[PDB]
């Protein structure tokens, strides 16, 4: 039997989407922070209108108020950017020894990611964070 369908192009896609976002209080962006790369994305195909993305990162502390707001800068970007039924999957592994299993519902729950969405001050600076830098050369 042949090998299966791998949609590597799309994962280079969601990869670039992703790339440009800020950090929650840093003005430079994940890539430059080192929170992602390449081997951080994948994607598969579900049905010939319907895909799965996967993404599975490392925050630039090990604390929930940046390593949450992160995953959901990751989720809103993608989740709003995308063409057509792009279900997405986000995971984490920095915390204590306990925090990062809720990190993991923060992010990637659809009613805690809601919740987030209706919160203005998370709102706020999700969209700052996910809106991309033009140049930003003043120094």
């Known amino acids: 039997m042949?090998?299966?369908?791998?949609?590597?192009?799309?994962a280079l896609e969601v990869y670039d989407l992703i790339r440009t976002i800020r950090d929650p209080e840093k003005p430079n962006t994940?890539?430059?922070?080192?929170?992602?790369?390449?081997?951080?994305?994948?994607?598969?195909?579900?049905?010939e209108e319907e895909y799965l993305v996967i993404i599975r990162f490392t925050p630039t502390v090990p604390h929930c108020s940046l390593?949450?707001?992160?995953?959901?800068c990751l989720r809103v970007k993608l989740q709003?950017?995308?063409?057509?039924?792009?279900?997405?999957?986000?995971?984490?592994?920095?915390?204590?020894?306990?925090t990062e299993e809720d990190i993991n519902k923060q992010?990637?729950?659809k009613e805690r990611?809601?919740?987030?969405?209706?919160?203005?001050?998370?709102?706020?600076?999700?969209?700052?964070?996910?809106?991309?830098?033009?140049q930003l050369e003043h120094h």
């Open 2 to 10: 042949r090998q299966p369908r791998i949609m590597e192009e799309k």
């Open 80 to 98: 709003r950017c995308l063409p057509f039924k792009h279900k997405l999957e986000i995971y984490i592994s920095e915390g204590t020894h306990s």
């Open 30 to 47: 994940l890539e430059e922070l080192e929170v992602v790369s390449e081997s951080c994305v994948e994607v598969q195909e579900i049905n």
């Open 107 to 109: 992010i990637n729950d």
């Open 67 to 72: 390593a949450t707001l992160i995953g959901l």
């Open 113 to 134: 990611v809601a919740a987030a969405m209706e919160n203005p001050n998370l709102r706020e600076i999700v969209e700052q964070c996910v809106l991309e830098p033009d």
